[PDB]
């Protein structure tokens, strides 16, 4: 049972989800982050890229 770092609801297997590897290590709904399907597609396909949530990037 993983709470969405943004909206705080469960992150089920049937949804689009992404992990902050900048720091906080939380899972988030792709929808909640504001990340487009295309950005998701490309970022997860890209070997040398990782994602960071917005609070994690601010500091």
């Amino acid at each position: 049972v993983y709470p969405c770092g943004i909206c705080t609801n469960e992150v089920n297997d049937d949804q689009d989800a992404i992990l902050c590897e900048a720091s906080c290590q939380k899972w988030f709904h792709r929808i909640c982050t504001g990340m487009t399907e295309t950005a998701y597609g490309l970022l997860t396909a890209e070997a040398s890229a990782v994602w960071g949530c917005d609070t994690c990037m601010a500091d």
Binding site: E21, A22, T33, G34, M35, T36, T38, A39, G41, L42, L43, E46, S48, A49, V50, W51, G52, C53, D54, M57
Partner: protein
């Protein structure tokens, strides 16, 4: 003791990089130019 460089994207940066691959302007999302 192998080390590697990983580029971290914000959501904004990701959405921008994706728009740029869609509009053929860049190869990939890590194709940073100056």
């Amino acid at each position: 003791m192998a080390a590697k460089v990983v580029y971290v994207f914000s959501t904004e940066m990701a959405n921008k990089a994706a728009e740029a691959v869609l509009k053929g302007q860049v190869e990939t999302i890590v194709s940073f130019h100056i």
